[PDB]
């Protein structure tokens, strides 16, 4: 077919400085593409507000030549007034480079000697050139190769592009139903050179994959339990320094044990909702750990609970707002009980009982001790699994990956000149990358 031309504008509204006090008490921003409003920020405090809000405008129509920002005042005395504004032509934005500048503000109204102030905006105006998908065929075949040599090299060359490369690679392997090959091989290599407590490519791939595949396991296991804790008024406090007097610490500990027992049972039963691919990846984690440490017979449960509980379940109990569990913030009593439940679930997932560092928590130890074997059995059965699939814009993501190859070509060249089994494929990757660039030039030359 023909070349795809995709325009995008990312805007970061950071803060404003010395807004006129005579007109601003709760300033907020209106964002326009040309003169058409497309978004707005929240209302912030005072004359020097800080927003730090990001806006992504993908697939810009070809007639967008600028973005404008208008600063209004959120008030109830009248309709919100349009006070100040700036404008920025897209022609001043270097394509692909993220700019960071303060803009002197203009006015919709006479200011009569009052200084307008400034507005700090970060802006990235990008242009993607995407060939038809068939042109990336050989490129795609080299990436989906079974030993992932190109994947290894791309992780080594991307220092700060950890999250972007992971996002693009994850969507590509998901599109090709090969997310198991990607995640299992990288997790196995990660265990082979040691765990997982470092922010590696394997950890952020598992984090992105689990945020996309385990959302309804978390809901089915935690929503009902946390809802009951949200409307509750019975305390679970055990620290004698935080106990308002006339409180029986034994009723509080009894209530905590009833909460933990019902929630732990709910987690064990909601396990059936986990998708089989994620469970298969958990079993591969267990096999890789068993290969490396056949003597650490406890490690096979440690490696799984670190993802299921330490990274997924326990932070969802602590911060249930960021997981679409509950929109309303917890009560101070509900927050305290949630923290106590999370600490207990964490220690149970680690197969350890509270110690002399938390002497007030020893009342949960009998519950933890009697459930440790249930937790071991729960995790071993988790990985006990030996079109409706999630797709993406394949050509777009392949084009984005090729751009990363082009920008890191010389460091990938250093990589191809090292001894190992990855040598030939990295040489092919370089040849394919230059060929794709030559052909992108041909599409651009013929309009």
Curated annotation (Swiss-Prot):
Annotated tissue distribution: In placental villi, detected only in the trophoblast layer (cytotrophoblast and syncytiotrophoblast). Not detected in stromal, endothelial or Hofbauer cells (at protein level).
Phosphoserine carried by residues: 239
Gene Ontology MF term list: GTPase activator activity; GTPase activity; GTPase binding; phosphotyrosine residue binding; potassium channel inhibitor activity; signaling receptor binding
Ranges where the C2 domain occurs: 1-103
Site (Arginine finger) location in chain: 197
Post-translational modification summary for this protein: The N-terminus is blocked.
GO biological process, one term: vasculogenesis
Gene Ontology CC, one term: cytosol
Record annotation: effect of changing residue 176 to V: In CMAVM1; uncertain significance
Primary location recorded for the protein, binned into one broad class: cytoplasm
Keyword line: Acetylation, Cytoplasm, Disease variant, GTPase activation, Phosphoprotein, Repeat, SH2 domain, SH3 domain, Tumor suppressor
Compartments reported by the entry: Cytoplasm
Domain annotation Ras-GAP: ranges: 177-382
Modified sites of kind Phosphotyrosine: 28
Disorder named in the UniProt entry: Mutations in the SH2 domain of RASA seem to be oncogenic and cause basal cell carcinomas. Capillary malformation-arteriovenous malformation 1: A disorder characterized by atypical capillary malformations that are multiple, small, round to oval in shape and pinkish red in color. These capillary malformations are associated with either arteriovenous malformation, arteriovenous fistula, or Parkes Weber syndrome. CMAVM1 inheritance is autosomal dominant.
Role according to the record: Inhibitory regulator of the Ras-cyclic AMP pathway. Stimulates the GTPase of normal but not oncogenic Ras p21; this stimulation may be further increased in the presence of NCK1.
Subunit: Interacts with SQSTM1. Interacts with SPSB1; the interaction does not promote degradation. Interacts with CAV2 (tyrosine phosphorylated form). Directly interacts with NCK1. Interacts with PDGFRB (tyrosine phosphorylated). Interacts (via SH2 domain) with the 'Tyr-9' phosphorylated form of PDPK1. Interacts with tyrosine-phosphorylated EPHB4.
Protein name as annotated: Ras GTPase-activating protein 1
Species annotation: Homo sapiens
Encoding gene per record: RASA1
């Amino acid at each position: 077919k023909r070349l795809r031309q995709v325009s995008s504008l990312v805007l970061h509204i950071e803060e404003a400085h010395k807004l006129p006090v005579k007109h601003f008490t709760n300033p907020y921003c209106n964002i326009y593409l040309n003169s058409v409003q497309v978004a707005k920020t929240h209302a912030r405090e005072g004359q020097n507000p800080v927003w730090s809000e990001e806006f992504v405008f993908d697939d810009l129509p070809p007639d967008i030549n600028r973005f404008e920002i208008t600063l209004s005042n959120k008030t109830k005395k009248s309709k919100d007034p349009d006070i100040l504004f700036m404008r920025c032509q897209l022609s001043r934005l270097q394509k692909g480079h993220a700019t960071d500048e303060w803009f002197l503000l203009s006015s919709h109204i006479p200011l009569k000697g009052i200084e307008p102030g400034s507005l700090r905006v970060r802006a990235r105006y990008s242009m993607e050139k995407i060939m038809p998908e068939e042109e990336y065929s050989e490129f795609k075949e080299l990436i989906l190769q079974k030993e992932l040599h190109v994947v290894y090299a791309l992780s080594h060359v991307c220092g700060q592009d950890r999250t972007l490369l992971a996002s693009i690679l994850l969507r590509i392997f998901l599109h090709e139903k090969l997310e198991s090959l990607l995640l299992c091989t990288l997790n196995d290599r990660e265990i082979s050179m040691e765990l997982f407590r470092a922010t590696t490519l394997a950890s952020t791939l598992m984090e992105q994959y689990m945020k996309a595949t385990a959302t309804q396991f978390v809901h089915h296991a935690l929503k009902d339990s946390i809802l009951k804790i949200m409307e509750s008024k019975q305390s679970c406090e055990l620290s004698p320094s935080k106990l308002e007097k006339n409180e029986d610490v034994n009723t509080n500990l009894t209530h905590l044990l009833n909460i933990l027992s019902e929630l732990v049972e709910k987690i064990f039963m909601a396990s059936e909702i986990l998708p089989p691919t994620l469970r298969y990846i958990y079993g591969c984690l267990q096999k890789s750990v068993q290969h490396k440490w056949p003597t650490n017979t406890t490690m096979r449960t440690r490696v799984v609970s670190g993802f299921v509980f330490l990274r997924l379940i326990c932070p969802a109990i602590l911060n249930p707002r960021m997981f679409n569990i509950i929109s309303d913030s917890p009560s101070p009593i509900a927050a305290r009980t949630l923290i106590l439940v999370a600490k207990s679930v964490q220690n149970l997932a680690n197969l350890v009982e509270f110690g002399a560092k938390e002497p007030y928590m020893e009342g949960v130890n009998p519950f933890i001790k009697s459930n440790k074997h249930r937790m071991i059995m729960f995790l071993d059965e988790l990985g006990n699994v030996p079109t409706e699939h999630s797709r993406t814009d394949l050509s777009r993501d392949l084009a984005a990956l090729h751009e990363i190859c082009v920008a890191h070509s010389d460091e990938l060249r250093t990589l191809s000149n090292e001894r190992g089994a990855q040598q030939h494929v990295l040489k092919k990757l370089l040849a394919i990358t230059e060929l794709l660039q030559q052909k992108q030039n041909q599409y651009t030359k013929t309009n």
